[PDB]
Structure 1
Amino acid sequence: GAMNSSNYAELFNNDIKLFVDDTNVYRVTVHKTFEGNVATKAINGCIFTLNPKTGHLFLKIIHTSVWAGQKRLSQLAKWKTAEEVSALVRSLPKEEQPKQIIVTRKAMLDPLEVHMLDFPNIAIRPTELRLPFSAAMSIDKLSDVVMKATEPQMVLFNIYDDWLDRISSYTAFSRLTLLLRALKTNEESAKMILLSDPTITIKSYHLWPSFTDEQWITIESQMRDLILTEYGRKYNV
C-alpha cells in the first residue's frame, strides 16, 4: 500500500526500509546550438537512497558517461536507477537488506519491481507524500562529490550527522524534511539561515552545522517561517 500521513510512523519501526529518490539521476543543462536549435548537455547525477531510521544514505553517483549513445534518457534513467538499487540490495548481507523500498515517484514502481523479481519478499511501495528529497543536491558536500566524480561511484553518508545521539529518528527525519523543504523553496535564504553565524561550523565528517539543541530550535523555527512565507510570496497571502 501507498505511504501517506496516516502510516507515517512506520518509517521509524524496526523493519529495514529504504526511500529511493530518482529525481537527480538524469540532470541536463538546456542550451542553444550554433544553428539556433536547442540541445541538452548532461551533468553528473545521483540516486538518493536513504534509511529513514538510521539516516544511512547510499549516494550512487551517476556519471554522465552512462548516458553516452543511449536514447530516451528520461526513461532509461528510471531503469538505471532500478538496476543500481537492486545491485545495492544484492550487495548487502541478508540481514541488512530492506523489507520495504519506498519510491518517491510512481514511475519507478514498475522498473524497480522488474529489477527486484529475485526478491519477492521486498515490498515496493509508492508514497502520497510530496517529499523534498530533490533538494539533496542543495547540500554542498553532496553536490560537491557528485560534480567532481569522474567515474561511477558509491558514496556513503549519514544524512543525520550525529543527531540520533540526542533525538529520535522521527525527529531527525522531521528535521531533515524541514531543512530540505526549506532548501527547495528558497535555497539562498535557507543557506543564509544555516550559515549566518560564523562561529557554528560543519564538522569535516558531517553535512550540516554543529548546532546545540537550543540553536536547532531557533534554526528549525527560521526554516518554518521561510516555508510559510515563500508560500505567501508565491500565493500572495
Structure 2
Amino acid sequence: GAMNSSNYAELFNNDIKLFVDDTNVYRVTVHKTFEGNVATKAINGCIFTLNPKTGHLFLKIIHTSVWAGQKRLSQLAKWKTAEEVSALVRSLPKEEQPKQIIVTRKAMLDPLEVHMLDFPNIAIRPTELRLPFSAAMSIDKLSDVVMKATEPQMVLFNIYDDWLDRISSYTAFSRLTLLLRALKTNEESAKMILLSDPTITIKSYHLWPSFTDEQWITIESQMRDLILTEYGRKYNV
C-alpha cells in the first residue's frame, strides 16, 4: 500500500521499483494580456521517473506541442504522465520491468492504474514521504535539456553520478533527497553551496560536483544548516 518511514529500506532491496513525479509535466507562466486579462503560456516539462536503487533516471521531456488545442490541461497532464510511464514499462525487457511504481502525488494513482491494467502484477502505490523531486528542474543540466527540446524526447541519466562506487544506495538516496530539499527550499543559497568553490567541477558526464568524501560531509552539513534556517526564517525560531 502506501509508502512511509516504517518501510523505508524497501526502496533499496532487490525488487525493481520506480518513483514517478509528475510535478514538472505541465508548466506555465501566467501573464497579463493586452486587454488586461490573464493568460498562461506553457513551457516544456518533464516526467521524473527514478529507480532509487540504481540511480537510473528516465527523463521524458514533455514538449509544449503536446498541449496544443487541448482542454483541462492539468487533468490531461496526469493521464499523459501515465501513458508515458506505461509506454516506458512496455519498452523495457520483462526482467527490467518494475514490480512496483510509487507515485509522489496520489492524484496519479487512478490514471496510472488504468493505463497499467495490462500489468496486474505491477503494484501502483502512493507514498507519505514529502519527496523533493519537483526541484529536479533546479539541476542545471536537467533544466537545460528540457528547455532546449524541440520535440518529445526521452533522456537517460544517473542521478547519483558515480556515488554508488563509494556509498550504498540508501546513503545515495538520502544525499539526493537532501540536495533536492535544499534546492527546493532556497535555490540560490543551495546552488551557492554546491558551486561556490571554483576548484571543484562537474564532470562532463555528471550532474553534481566531484566532491571527495570529506567534502560531501561538509556539503551535506551546509545543506542541513540551510534547510533548518529557512525553516526558522519562515516560522521565526
TM (norm. structure 1) is 1.00
Per the alignment, in what secondary structure is the counterpart of residue 117 of structure 1? coil
Per the alignment, in what secondary structure is the counterpart of residue 4 of structure 1? coil
**Ranges of 4+ aligned residues in structure 1 off by more than 6 Å:** none
Distance 1:13 1:29 in 2: 40
Task: Determine if the alignment matches structure 1 residue 93 to structure 2 residue 93.
Answer: yes
Per the alignment, in what secondary structure is the counterpart of residue 118 of structure 2? coil
Per the alignment, in what secondary structure is the counterpart of residue 39 of structure 1? strand
Distance 1:119 1:37 in 2: 46
Per the alignment, in what secondary structure is the counterpart of residue 191 of structure 1? helix
| CA displacement at 1:88 relative to structure 2 | 0.1
| CA displacement at 1:227 relative to structure 2 | 0.5
| CA displacement at 1:156 relative to structure 2 | 0.1
Q: 1:174-227 CA distances to partner (integer Å, 9 max, x unpaired)? A: 000000000000000000000010000000000000000000000000000000
Instruction: Tell me which residue corresponds to 1:225.
Output: 225
Q: 1:46-88 CA distances to partner (integer Å, 9 max, x unpaired)? A: 0000000000000000000000000000000000000000000
Distance 2:39 2:129 in 1: 33
Q: 1:80-130 CA distances to partner (integer Å, 9 max, x unpaired)? A: 000000000000000000000000000000000000000000000000011
Distance 1:129 1:163 in 2: 23
TM (norm. structure 2) is 1.00
Distance 2:227 2:4 in 1: 21
| CA displacement at 1:142 relative to structure 2 | 0.1
Gaps of 5+ in 2: none
Distance 1:209 1:90 in 2: 34
Distance 1:180 1:3 in 2: 19
Distance 2:177 2:30 in 1: 29
Distance 1:185 1:234 in 2: 11
Per the alignment, in what secondary structure is the counterpart of residue 6 of structure 2? helix
Q: 1:28-51 CA distances to partner (integer Å, 9 max, x unpaired)? A: 000000000000000000000000
Distance 1:236 1:184 in 2: 19
Distance 2:162 2:235 in 1: 37
Question: Aligned pair count?
Answer: 237
| CA displacement at 1:15 relative to structure 2 | 0.2
Distance 1:184 1:164 in 2: 24
Identity %: 100
| CA displacement at 1:169 relative to structure 2 | 0.1
1:1-237 pair list within 5 angstroms: 1-237=1-237
Per the alignment, in what secondary structure is the counterpart of residue 230 of structure 1? helix
CA RMSD, 1 decimal: 0.2
Distance 2:136 2:8 in 1: 21
Distance 1:129 1:212 in 2: 29
Distance 1:223 1:61 in 2: 28
| CA displacement at 1:133 relative to structure 2 | 0.1
Distance 2:91 2:233 in 1: 46
Distance 1:87 1:42 in 2: 24
